Design a protein around this nucleic acid. Sequence first.
DNA 1: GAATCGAATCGCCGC
RNA 2: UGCGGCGAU
DNA 3: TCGATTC
Length: 856
Amino acid sequence: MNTINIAKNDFSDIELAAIPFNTLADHYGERLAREQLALEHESYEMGEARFRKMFERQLKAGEVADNAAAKPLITTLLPKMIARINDWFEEVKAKRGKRPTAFQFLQEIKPEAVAYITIKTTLACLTSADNTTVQAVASAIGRAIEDEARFGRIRDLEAKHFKKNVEEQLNKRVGHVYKKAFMQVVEADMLSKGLLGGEAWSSWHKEDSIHVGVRCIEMLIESTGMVSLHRQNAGVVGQDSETIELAPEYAEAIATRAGALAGISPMFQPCVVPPKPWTGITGGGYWANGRRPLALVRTHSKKALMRYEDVYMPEVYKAINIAQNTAWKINKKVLAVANVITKWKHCPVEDIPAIEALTAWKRAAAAVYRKDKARKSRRISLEFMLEQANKFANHKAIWFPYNMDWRGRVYAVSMFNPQGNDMTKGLLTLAKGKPIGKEGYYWLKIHGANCAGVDKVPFPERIKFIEENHENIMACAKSPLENTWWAEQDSPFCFLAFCFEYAGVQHHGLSYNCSLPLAFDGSCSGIQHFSAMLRDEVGGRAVNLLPSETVQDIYGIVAKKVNEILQADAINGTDNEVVTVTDENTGEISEKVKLGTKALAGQWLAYGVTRSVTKRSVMTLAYGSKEFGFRQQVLEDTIQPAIDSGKGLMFTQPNQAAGYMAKLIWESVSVTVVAAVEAMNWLKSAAKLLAAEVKDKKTGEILRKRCAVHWVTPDGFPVWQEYKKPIQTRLNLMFLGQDSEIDAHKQESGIAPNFVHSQDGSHLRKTVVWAHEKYGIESFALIHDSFGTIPADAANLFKAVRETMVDTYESCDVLADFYDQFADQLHESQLDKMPALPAKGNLNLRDILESDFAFA
DNA sequence: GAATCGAATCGCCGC
RNA sequence: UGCGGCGAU
DNA sequence: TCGATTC
């Protein structure tokens, strides 16, 4: 009800603490320490204000139980509330005579659903409604019970298979009134089908719903002292009323928890001094001893964090500290452009002036609904980034703290970060620059082509395109408001950043000091690393690991391969056959035609398949997508947009075309990048064998317990995959749903993507130290796959990122090391089932050193 | 045994 | 946590 | 689609 302010005592400590300020003052002076400590104090100030506004909004709408302050109270209160209503059913069943009015209504709804509905709606009514009378909350409890009881039968019994297609539609709706209206509409559709047994819901009378809530309030009172009954003006027939008041101890508990969480959640901001070097697991980045300390590894469990303190990983610690030491400054020229065009447009780039029908309208209506949500959500991120950029514009340099996830990929801790979108990327440039030279001017021009989308074309033609458009680049840099050409580009704000630096080198020559980040980005990091482990030549050429005559587009290679299958199937494909299909819920037997491969090939060739049909399928391969996942993708990305546009008349039956295309893509990717498919299968089966508990069916006892997966990456970072699932969970249709065993499915679903993401993090970290020590590189722009530095350092970072990969996979076979970790953990019965290590190919790693288009 | 289900990480915003 | 949306890879 | 979990 009334939250304590953590700021008065706790937040003042981080500014006035004796030891953090001196350690900051000895490195960078006392006056920079005062500004930094006040900035970190403001970071905690803003985060507490964020929690308070959210809490007050949840107080108004009755969403207090959704807040994390009320969760520990409900978690202990719920087991006694569920038992009290279960016992009361047993007492009434033993009781003779008339059953109570509420007894019949309580049985149909789930009893655990009663316990949360009562607790949530009581606290919603006590906190917000301003009426403490028993009947108003009791009517609210009964109406909430009836709403779950009336529409729960759709989820529970008659449509438990039909719900899975309306569940996603229900989840897309936001707000209980919006969720209810669709639930009424779906009930009318289901009752027309006769699916619910043809029994329409009989609406509870208003007097009946109060009797439901009153008994539930009393049953909560016997279970817990959440509310105490009060009777006012008793004996007066006109003024007799009964009220319930929330427990002062329980309201104190939520406020104490709310004040604690308000100090735990800060809004992280860039550092005005270089960040504190990561000496250990905690305390790195920001200097002050605070309530929320930064962790080297972002772990969901504190036990997983504690595994990192014993291990000695010197190279991991250096690479983060070098990345933190990179100084950034806000590019003022792009900021001056961005400040004026953002006031005129929600997104400055979204519109530039240049030279089954009902279901189609329903999907069109859902398109303008999500776009309205999208355009609001996109803007509120932009306003925060612009304010952060405008705040630190005048500072000579800012620094970003760096930590990393449990896999090993590094991220910037601050909310404003170089790892953001195009505008945020363009608003940030490196602080320490060097004279550009001929090599840097060449690489600056190459970076200008990449921001323009000329990345698919080899290096000499990328240089030519910049020189052809030289007069347009100078005109855009001369006045970005007068010429909109830079906005039309793929990466507009970063392209405009290149235009300013391109114009400076024309005015000031090759002696110009350029501090612009020059990003080299690997084409497909997961497949590059997978092709490197198993030395697959055709995969490495597809991901530009090998030197090539031109930049090789893996989407185009697959699109060419599926095109070859399409033309062959158009001549020798299967003819169409009629197939019986039965809808199980209806029981209806119908005879539909099945399109053969010959007919399906003719449809797709009439559409014309390009890299765009195959593009998303290739990207999601490293995440674990296969033929089934591709079927949904080609439908939503190519077929469904076609039929809204008037195309797709060829796709007479869209799902058959999707399954046909998914098979063709999966056959093509499996033969294009062989190592990627085999390596992910080896990792998935290894995790599956380690996940599963081993028992003989006649002995019952488990010979081997469910085991987690652990491996160590080449630069010394250990990573533990322990996906764990809760035993029980609660779900309500109209209300928010409210040690532990290893979830085997998540262990298999995540082993291969996280392993290759651990490899790219080690590659990024090894690249940072190699470029820092073998070469003179001190400024780094790191976004997982992208490696960026100043133009004068751009040539060496180009060499360094290749040298680290060729050294890493020559030194270690990470898959073979992985097999050494879990082989002793494996049960002897699983040993015969375990696949052998995938065969090593013909690719030579030294060719990566001379590959122009790897970029990484 | 039949029944039935699934189909990467990190942040921000909202419910 | 989950759900919805956005972005990064 | 299919090898799973999952009852």
